From Swiss-Prot, chain A:
One of its GO terms (biological process) is positive regulation of canonical Wnt signaling pathway. It is found in: Golgi apparatus membrane; Cytoplasmic vesicle membrane; Cell membrane; Endoplasmic reticulum membrane. PANTHER family: INTEGRAL MEMBRANE PROTEIN GPR177 (PTHR13449), PROTEIN WNTLESS HOMOLOG (PTHR13449:SF2). Interacts with WNT3A. Interacts with WNT1, WNT3 and WNT5A. This is Protein wntless homolog. Keywords: Cell membrane, Cytoplasmic vesicle, Developmental protein, Disease variant, Endoplasmic reticulum, Endosome, Glycoprotein, Golgi apparatus, Membrane, Transmembrane, Transmembrane helix, Wnt signaling pathway. It comes from Homo sapiens (Human). Its main location: Golgi. The keyword Cell membrane applies. It is linked to Zaki syndrome: An autosomal recessive disorder characterized by developmental delay, progressive microcephaly, and short stature, as well as dysmorphic features including sparse scalp hair, cupped ears, wide nose and mouth, short philtrum, and high-arched palate. Other variable features have been observed, including ocular, skeletal, cardiac, and renal anomalies.
From Swiss-Prot, chain B:
An alpha-D-glucoside binds at residues 92, 94, 111, 118, 213. The gene is CALR. This is Calreticulin. Residues 1-180 are annotated as: N-domain. Its main location: endoplasmic reticulum.
UniProtKB/Swiss-Prot annotation, chain C:
This is Protein Wnt-3a. Disulfide bonds join 38-49, 89-97, 99-116, 164-178, 166-173, 242-273, 258-268, 272-312, 288-303, 290-300, 295-296. Changing residue 295 to A: No signaling activity despite the presence of significant amounts of secreted monomeric Wnt3a, exhibits dominant negative properties. Moderately expressed in placenta and at low levels in adult lung, spleen, and prostate. GO terms for cellular component: cell surface; early endosome membrane; endocytic vesicle membrane; endoplasmic reticulum lumen; extracellular exosome; extracellular region; extracellular space; glutamatergic synapse. Pfam families: wnt.
Length: 493, 273, 313
């Protein structure tokens, strides 16, 4: 049987100890060294005023520094200057003053929120939509001209409600508008970004008519924190050689046999390839080049591991049915692998329709229109149904195989010595993996729920320990060590 | 000749039960009652349509013979007594075509025309009028003040094919003017290239329903003595015969009730101390 | 101009002005927005944050008294300074506030390594280092001033809503990001108005650790309870606002107007301090029947409408 069937309890114990030491180190690295996953800076947009010269000639408005725009503090100041819509531009400068953005901030999110003011004569219409004429540009040094990156209409729906009674006693109070998503970029590659938002209005077309009275536009810039990416890459540059060593060792130990590998060994190796796909730090090329597709590639690279591991569990449970099958061909697993394959492909199509489309329009988001919303929700629902169906199949398989194990165990003394060792080792080998996998899955879910409710920090003694970053690094270390132990312990003798 | 498009005085006492259809759009609608009120001039000629529940939406309507005012003068008349002296509540009428399913109507139903005093809050006390036109609901430019007290008062509206109108209250004119000069139907003349006149402003294709759908906080007010016709003189003489006959009797009777109240209050103040 | 025209600053405030010179316009904006809210919240209550152009005391002697009105003024001014400084940091006009470090090679908790988290503290920091500086002298007035100022700052600190956005595997919430969102300053106005209606009176006490006297305030714990850093406090009874009296700093209601018809927002029969509740009716001229864009200068037609002037004696 496999090497775990031959390993004495002492050597298995020392292996477990080494694995746990590496586990705790992988938790600490994110806990103490890493600076936490994401920043969230909040900019107030500065209401520049167009000089009316720009009929067709295009120029960019800057909130501060040299050549700052003609500026308005309170939007009411437009009225006695006789300033009108189509002339007020909500300009935003992305790195706050005396700062820079560096490619280590592997992405940018931006989401809007509007300070719409209630007024009895200008309430929001029931299905109002904002039609921003957004344009964005980048620059690389504090004196070069801005060069355009994007210029696109960005319609959005106003989900806004008013909590105070609709009485003239409460005019001027803001609506509680939700955070409408705005833009995502898969890689920062330039030092400064300038962003202009305009709200042109036309009564006949009803573009931006009846959206209420907007006092200010608030824009929140989210990015992966600069030190966390360096910690992540320092971890990946350690895991890559280790997994390559384990892969070459496993491949040699598989090929160097009289018999060809069984299906379990093939799927173990495939899981290894999928994970060494994740470990290879090809993200470390993104700090030099301007590759916008990095986020989509990362998402597909992670999905290929999930859809491989979920299939590995089923293949493992199937390959331990003790009797009446003993077949090795993959085609017998259609009923079980089909659900996860279909779910994975469907969720991949959804992720394409959002993230890959965003490559041509950074402001796109599928949740804007009802057709897109319904299609994306159909894909997500099909994925969820496939996942639940798969999980039911997995629970049924585990129940059936424990049925087989109990039945066979009621007859172990009867057959020969070597066959008795074979079957008892099969029982132990299966139980070991299921206990380890239950421990890892339960621990991952527990630390995931903790990362959802925690503040993001924990004060211990004189130091602060990151919880969110420790979670990411710890779970990544957990499943990497899980794959390592799986490869080592389940190779042939 | 005076065409009686609609008319009612509840002289039968029970004709309301057949002529009016209440809306069942919402289950919590207030229910009207027929009564002459706490003070009146006539026992039966003043027994009108009364609101009875506080803080309710109301929706009552009655159908009438279909007609069109194209090439004809339009007249509407009704009388109201504000028994409770509302601090907020509607006191207006709506007219509808025959397409209105009276079982389902509500405040958002599409009417042809709106007319009546509107009293909600002491800050605004102006008579409310709204005419539908080519998908637009348009309201008056100039203002007309409504009456204050609980006494029974008469209201009347008049529209002419010459695109002119006039408002009659208590059988007396209160306002007159031209439709396109007092409503924002058409774009302003200034020569603006989009401008072109439309004589069809004063008329609608058809009418078949008179409706009373409204909100009130204080109930108690009563509505009576309705008329829809083409003849201004018929409306004037009907208003005289239906309101001038009661004016003096109701005045005297509520005056004597107020005097009785003053006697009772002053003698209670004398006895209490 | 810096730290020269402004007359009333105490030496800590001069040093703060000389160091954080760029912040001072934002502090003036915060004072202005706070005073606007204190005018709005009391536009009926017999006293409506009336300003006087004397420039030595822009409200007159009345707010020097340790009364609930001065309590509200101090609380809303502190909240306004905090809000305006936070907004100005958000606009990016202020280069001083928060983290301002350009580059960090080794782990150094700067921008390029740790991001920025210290920004959200700046409004409270500047408001407390500015407003509380003049209230160091240990009088009962100053103790009340400090408590009310902290109450104003905690009002802003309490109403910051937490909002979250998430991203990850395929847009799922495995990576979640959250930030604090500023509250609308009208909401803080209503909240401080509610606190003003529920302000607690509490009495003065005197003692010192050394040979001398130092003052502190003692709550009226017989019925009510005052939570620290949350509720406004005062120790001087508010004067009657009916008659004009420059000695106490109160201006009469001889020119004020109210909802005379059938009621009064705080009692028209009371706040008018007399009889005669109507003075004129005016044909006000105003824009009407407008197209109403979302912003400004609708350039619409105009008309005149009659309004009743219930100015009362
Ligand atoms: C001075 O003194 C006092 C107190 O000190 C204050 O005066 C009032 O105080 C009270 C207390 O809050 C308030 O008045 C009323 O409060 C009640 C609370 O429930 C409400 O009943 C009432 O609500 C009306 O107005 C609100 C405005 O938000 C509406 O939401 C509500 O639906 C009520 O409006 C209906 O009723 C009005 C009168 O009946 C109609 O004029 C109005 O159009 C609306 O009617 C609808 O329904 C009918 C039939 O169902 C339809 O025909 C209507 O359609 C028409 O209008 C629509 C829309 O324009 C068009 O689409 C359509 O074409 C038309 O046909 C409607 O669909 C009050 O809130 C209030 O505070 C004060 N009253 C006021 C200001 O009027 C005062 O505040 C104090 N202070 C001061 C003055 O400063
Ligand atoms: C139910 C709740 C379950 C929640 C599960 C989510 C756990 C969080 C995992 C952290 C994500 C992660 O580290 O991905 C790594 C591998 O990811 C893996 O290979 C871990 C496999 C997790 C198995 C989940 C089974 C749970 C059973 C049920 C690779 O990620 P990356 O592409 O290299 O970069 C992403 C970095 N970032 C996340 C900061 C963007």
């Amino acid at each position: 049987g496999a090497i775990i069937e031959n390993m004495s309890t002492k050597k298995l114990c020392i292996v477990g100890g080494i694995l746990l030491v590496f586990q705790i180190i992988a938790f600490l690295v994110g806990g103490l060294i890493a600076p936490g996953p994401t920043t969230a800076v909040s900019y107030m947009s500065v209401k520049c005023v167009d000089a009316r010269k720009n009929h067709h000639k295009t120029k960019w408005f800057v909130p501060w520094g040299p050549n700052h725009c003609d500026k308005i503090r309170d939007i009411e100041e437009a009225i006695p200057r006789e300033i009108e819509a189509n002339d007020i531009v909500f300009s935003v400068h992305i790195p706050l003053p005396h700062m820079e953005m560096s490619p280590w901030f592997q992405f940018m999110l931006f989401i809007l929120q509007l300070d719409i003011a209630f007024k009895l004569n200008n309430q929001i219409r029931e299905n109002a939509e904002v039609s921003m004429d957004v344009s964005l540009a980048y620059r690389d040094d504090a004196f070069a001209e801005w060069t355009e990156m994007a210029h696109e209409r960005v319609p959005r729906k106003l989900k806004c409600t008013f909590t105070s009674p609709k009485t003239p006693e409460h005019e001027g109070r803001y609506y509680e508008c939700d955070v409408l998503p705005f833009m995502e970029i898969g890689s920062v590659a330039h030092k400064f970004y300038l962003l202009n938002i305009r709200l042109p209005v036309n009564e006949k077309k009803k573009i931006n008519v009846g959206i209420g009275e907007i006092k200010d536009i608030r824009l929140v810039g989210i990015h992966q924190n600069g030190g966390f990416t360096k910690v992540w890459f320092a971890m990946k540059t350690f895991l890559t050689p280790s997994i390559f060593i384990i892969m070459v060792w496993y491949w040699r130990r598989i090929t160097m046999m009289s018999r060809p590998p069984v299906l379990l060994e093939k799927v173990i190796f495939a899981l290894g390839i999928s994970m060494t796909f994740i470990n290879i730090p090809v993200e470390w090329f993104s700090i030099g080049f301007d590759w916008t597709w990095m986020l989509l590639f990362g998402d597909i690279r992670q999905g290929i591991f999930y859809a491989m591991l979920l299939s590995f569990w089923i293949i493992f449970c199937g390959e331990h049915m003790m009797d009446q099958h003993e077949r090795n061909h993959i085609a017998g697993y259609w009923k079980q692998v089909g659900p996860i394959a279909v779910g994975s492909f469907c969720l991949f199509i959804f992720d394409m329709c959002e993230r890959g489309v965003q490559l041509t329009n950074p402001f796109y988001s599928i949740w804007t229109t009802d057709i897109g919303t319904e299609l994306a929700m159909a894909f997500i629902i099909v994925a969820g149904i496939c996942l639940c169906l798969y999980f039911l199949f997995l629970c049924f398989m585990v129940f059936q195989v424990f049925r087989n194990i109990s039945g066979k165990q009621s007859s172990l003394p009867a057959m020969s010595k070597v066959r008795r060792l074979h079957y008892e080792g099969l029982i132990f080998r299966f139980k070991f993996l299921m206990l380890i996998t239950l421990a890892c899955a339960a621990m991952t879910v527990i630390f995931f729920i903790v990362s959802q409710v925690t503040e993001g920090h924990w004060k211990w003694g004189g130091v602060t320990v990151q919880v969110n970053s420790a979670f990411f690094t710890g779970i990544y270390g957990m499943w990497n060590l899980y794959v390592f132990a799986l490869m080592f312990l389940y190779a042939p003798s | 000749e005076p065409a009686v498009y609609f008319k009612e005085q509840f002289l039968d006492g029970d004709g309301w039960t057949s002529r009016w259809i209440e809306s069942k759009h919402k289950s919590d609608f207030g229910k009207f009652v027929l009564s002459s009120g706490k003070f009146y001039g006539d026992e039966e000629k003043d027994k009108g349509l009364q609101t009875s529940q506080d803080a309710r939406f109301y929706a009552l309507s009655a159908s009438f013979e279909p007609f069109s005012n194209k090439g004809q003068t339009l007249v509407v008349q009704f009388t109201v007594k504000h028994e409770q002296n509302i601090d907020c509540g509607g006191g207006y009428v709506k007219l509808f075509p025959n397409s209105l399913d009276q079982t389902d109507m509500h405040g958002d139903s599409e009417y042809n025309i709106m007319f009546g005093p509107d009293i909600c809050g002491p800050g605004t006390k102006k008579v409310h009028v709204i005419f539908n036109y080519k998908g637009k609901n348009v309201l008056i430019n100039k203002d007309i003040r409504c009456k204050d007290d609980e006494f029974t008062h008469l209201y009347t509206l008049i529209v002419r094919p010459d695109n002119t109108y006039e408002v009659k209250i208590d059988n007396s004119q209160v306002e007159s003017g031209s439709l396109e000069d007092d409503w924002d139907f058409l774009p302003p003349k200034k020569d603006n290239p989009e401008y072109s006149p439309d004589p069809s402003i004063y008329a609608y294709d058809n009418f078949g329903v008179l409706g009373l759908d409204l909100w009130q906080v204080k109930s108690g007010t009563i509505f009576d003595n309705f008329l829809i016709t083409n003849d201004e003189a018929y409306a004037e003489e009907f208003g005289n015969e239906t309101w001038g006959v009661t004016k003096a009797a109701e005045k005297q009777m509520k005056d004597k009730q107020d005097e009785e109240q003053r006697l009772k209050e002053e003698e209670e103040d004398k006895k209490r101390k | 101009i810096l730290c020269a025209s402004i007359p009333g600053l105490v030496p800590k405030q001069l040093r703060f002005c000389r160091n954080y010179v760029e912040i001072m316009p934002s502090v003036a904006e915060g004072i202005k927005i706070g005073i606007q809210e204190c005018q709005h919240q009391f536009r009926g209550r017999r006293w409506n944050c009336t300003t006087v152009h004397d420039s030595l005391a822009i409200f007159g002697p009345v707010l020097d008294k340790a009364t609930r009105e001065s309590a509200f003024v101090h609380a809303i001014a502190s909240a306004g300074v905090a809000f305006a400084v936070t907004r100005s940091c958000a606009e990016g006009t202020a280069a001083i506030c928060g983290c301002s470090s350009r580059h960090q090679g080794s782990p150094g908790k700067g921008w390029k390594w740790g991001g920025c988290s210290e920004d959200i503290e700046f409004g409270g920091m500047v408001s407390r280092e500015f407003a509380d500086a003049r209230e160091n002298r240990p009088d009962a007035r100053s103790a009340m001033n400090r408590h009310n100022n902290e109450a104003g700052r905690q009002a802003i600190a309490s109403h910051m809503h937490l909002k979250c956005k998430c991203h990850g595997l395929s847009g799922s919430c495995e990576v979640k990001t959250c930030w604090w969102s500023q509250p609308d300053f009208r909401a803080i106005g209503d909240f401080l108005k509610d606190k003003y209606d529920s302000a607690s009176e509490m009495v003065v006490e005197k003692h010192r650790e050394s040979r001398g006297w130092v003052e502190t305030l003692r709550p009226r714990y017989t019925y009510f309870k005052v939570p620290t850093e949350r509720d406004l406090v005062y120790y001087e009874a508010s004067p009657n606002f009916c008659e004009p009296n420059p000695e106490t700093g109160s201006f009469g209601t001889r020119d004020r107007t109210c909802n005379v018809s059938s009621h009064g927002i705080d009692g028209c029969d009371l706040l008018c301090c007399g009889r005669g509740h109507n003075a004129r009716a005016e044909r006000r001229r105003e824009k009407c029947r407008c197209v109403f864009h979302w912003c400004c200068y609708v350039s619409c037609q105009e008309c005149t409408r009659v309004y009743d002037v219930h100015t009362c004696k």
